[PDB]
Structures are given as C-alpha cells and as structure tokens.
Design a protein around this ligand. Sequence first.
Ligand SMILES: CO[C@@H]1[C@H](O)[C@H](n2cnc3c(=O)nc(N)[nH]c32)O[C@H]1COP(=O)(O)OP(=O)(O)OP(=O)(O)O
Ligand SMILES: [Zn+2]
Ligand SMILES: [Zn+2]
Ligand SMILES: [Zn+2]
Lengths: 48, 49, 67, 257, 44
Amino acid sequence: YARPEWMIVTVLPVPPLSVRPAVVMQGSARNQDDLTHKLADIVKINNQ
Amino acid sequence: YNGFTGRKITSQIFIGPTYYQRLKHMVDDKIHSRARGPIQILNRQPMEG
Amino acid sequence: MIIPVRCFTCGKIVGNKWEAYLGLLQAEYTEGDALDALGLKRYCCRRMLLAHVDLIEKLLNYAPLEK
Amino acid sequence: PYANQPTVRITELTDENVKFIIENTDLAVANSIRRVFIAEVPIIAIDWVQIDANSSVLHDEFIAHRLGLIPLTSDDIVDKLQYSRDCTCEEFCPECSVEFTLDVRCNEDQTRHVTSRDLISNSPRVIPVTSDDILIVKLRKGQELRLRAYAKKGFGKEHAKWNPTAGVAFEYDPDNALRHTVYPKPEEWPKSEYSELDEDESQAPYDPNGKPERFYYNVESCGSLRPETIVLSALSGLKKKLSDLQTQLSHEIQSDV
Amino acid sequence: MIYICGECHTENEIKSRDPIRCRECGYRIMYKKRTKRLVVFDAR
RNA sequence: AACUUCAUCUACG
Ligand SMILES: CO[C@@H]1[C@H](O)[C@H](n2cnc3c(=O)nc(N)[nH]c32)O[C@H]1COP(=O)(O)OP(=O)(O)OP(=O)(O)O
Ligand SMILES: [Zn+2]
Ligand SMILES: [Zn+2]
Ligand SMILES: [Zn+2]
C-alpha cells in the first residue's frame, strides 16, 4: 500500500475540474481556481 | 379594568408614559425557509444566506 | 414629521390642534395652560402635542424635485 | 331565569360627550356595551385612495394613512349605506361609498397648509367634520397634491380609523365595596369622581352579597357620530348580533332534529 | 422617456444611448418622473 | 421555464 519511494513526487496528480471549478463572471470572464494557477506555474517551471 | 370581562384587576397596575424605540431588527427581514433551492458549485451543498 | 391625526392611545383628533398650540405658546400661555385651552385632558393626548417634533418645516426648506 | 330590566340616567349631554349611568345590569352586558362602543359601531371613513400627483415631502402612503384617520360626518347615511361586500355593483358606487377629491397646489410663496377643508365630497352629508381643520400636509411652493378617495362603511374591529369614539370611561363600584381591587394602603388612593364616601373613609365597608351594578359611562365622540347616536347604534348593533346568532342557532337545531 | 433635471427642475426628453446632460443647465443627474399608471392605496 | 468568488467590516442571541 505504501513503498518509501512512492513518497517522493515523480508524478504530480492534477485534480479534476470538479475539485478546481472555473468561477464564471457574466460570461465575460472565467476566473480560475487557485489550484489552476498553481498548476499552471508548475507546468511552466516543468517545461522550462 | 380587565378589557375582556370588565372586572377590576385586583392588583393596581403601574401605568405611565415611557419613551420607546423601534429597533431595526424586524421579523420580516429574518424569516427564511429552504426547500431544494440553489446549491454551491464546489461543495454541491445548499447555499449560505 | 407632522402632527399625527388622532392620539394613539384614545383616538381624539389632535391633528387640528398643533397650529393653535403654537399660537397659544406664542401668546404667553405655558405649555400646560395651552394644552388645557385646546381641550386636551388625558395625559395620553397631552403627550401627543407636548412631545411632538415638527420636522415638516425643516423638510420644506429643500427645493422640490419638480417645479 | 330571565334578564334584568336595566335603567339609564343621563347626567351630561354635550356635542362631544355623553355621561350616563346604567343600573340593574350585569357587568358582562355593561362591558360588552362599552366594547361595542369602541369596536362595533359603524362609521364612514376613507379606505380607498388614488394619488394622481404627490410632490409633497410626505410619501404617498403616509398621505393615505392621514386621510384615512380623518373623521367624516356619518350621522345619518351610515345606516343607509351598504358595506362594499354587500353591494352588488363591482368596486364602489354611490350606495356603497362616498367620493372625495383633493386638488391643491402651492403657487404662492407662503407655505400652503392642506387641510381637511380642501377635501371635497360628492355627497353633502359626509363632510370631514368641517362645518381649526385637520392638517393633511404642508406644501412648499411648487409642490402639489392631487388625489381621489372613496369612503366606505365599517367598524373599528377592521381598523382604528373606524372607531367612532375617543375615550370610553367605564367605572363600577366607585367606592371599593366588592373588593374587586384590594388596595395595599387604601388611604394613599385618590377618591373617584363618582365616590359618595366621606373624606375620612378611604373605602366603603365590604359588601359580601354585593354584585357589580350602577355602571358609569363617559363616551366621548370623535365627531363623526353624535355621542348619543354612538350609544344607540352600539345597543342596536349588539342586539342585531345576538339576533343573527339566534337565527343561526335555530337553523342548526332544526338541522340536528 | 422624459427625465426631470436634478438642479433646474426642467423636464428634458433623452433618447436611449444618449448622454445624460440637461439642456440649458448641463446637470448630469436626471430623474425618471412619476408613472402614468395609478396605484391604489388602502388608507389603512 | 433562474443570478460568481474572495476579503473585510458592521450588527444579532
Ligand atoms: C443567556 O445566555 C445566552 C446564551 O449563552 C447565548 N449567546 C449570546 N451571545 C453569545 C455569544 O457571543 N457566543 C455564544 N456562544 N453564545 C451566545 O446568549 C447568552 C446571554 O447573553 P445576554 O447576557 O446579553 O442575555 P440578557 O441577559 O442580556 O437578556 P435581555 O433582558 O435583553 O432580554
Ligand atoms: Zn389620547
Ligand atoms: Zn356599489
Ligand atoms: Zn437641467
């Protein structure tokens, strides 16, 4: 159920959109959850 | 004197002009009821307020 | 804001008596003597004139929205 | 097993007041006559208001409230007028209502006091007890009040605007002899106006066999109905309520049989 | 519709998608003016 | 057949 190596993060789980809903305002804009912004930062750094 | 029956109330009652204030808290603003209404997006539970 | 028609407690008309009350106060009459002259007997009716604050005069100072 | 025969003696009768005494009557009957004075005597008062233009400082429903509280002469035709619910015609008509109109504008610089005198009735018998005047609103220059009102028959149980009386003074046992009120210190208590005691005696001696009788009334009219006719109409209305009750009771007894 | 001016109290008619400025005074606060339909008030 | 969130403050028993 838990091997010590699995504690080190080699694959980051990205939660479903239900966990991080997109906050819609007037249809003019769609703010994104804090998790979405943090995941964007993680993806940017990973690509770099 | 008792308003309903007209008989004198046995205990004499303290009456006088006192200044009273109507506070902003009114029942019509506070009465509320909920039955399968709107529901939040994240928790999918009934809303607040 | 304006003198209520009818005393709350009993219902005697006190709305017609505010201007006469003010006139009698201008004459020399004390508040109690003016209230007696107007015919107000119960302290419920005397409370209506005695405690009344006439704000309609202050509100009439502002210019009307449509002239 | 039968009703007692009451007696009335009128002490004072003025255009604003009736002071009378009812003897050989029950406390319940006396109190309910007083109660009918207050709540079950029909009168005429404004209950429908339509404000065409209100530029006064007071909002529309404030003006409507004040107009409703204004008394209206209801001496004779209140018995003739029908209730709006009873009247066959839709909304209101001359038989079920009386129309009033107010068209006041303050063209002059000086503040215009809109009074009950400015209310004009379509029927002469109902007038706003003008024959000072009740002040409806004060109008600054350039402010105008225009409205149409309908006055309907009703009694004070519906709304206090339909109260025909100001203060009903009801007293029994002026000197405490039935001990219906037990004074902790009898001497401190002021004597009643109807009291027959000497100044030394604070209370009359306890009457074990006594019953409340000889009730004293002072009925003050609001001006809509004469103080005499308030009392007469109250007695007649209570009698009519009892007769209606008896009719329904007889019908239901027949149904049970 | 017709909007009464806030300051000079003169009715001016402003079309839709037009700047809210009263002619002859320039005040930028207008008021919609009372409705023609009439509401019944019970005096109660 | 139908209107987001945060945050703050202010009140309520
Ligand atoms: C009697 O106890 C009650 C309850 O415990 C509940 N309550 C109230 N405030 C709070 C709060 O901040 N937090 C929590 N957890 N509970 C709270 O309110 C308490 C009393 O408060 P009070 O002492 O003002 O009641 P008066 O004696 O004043 O009553 P008056 O004569 O005005 O009607
Ligand atoms: Zn009074
Ligand atoms: Zn009719
Ligand atoms: Zn202008």
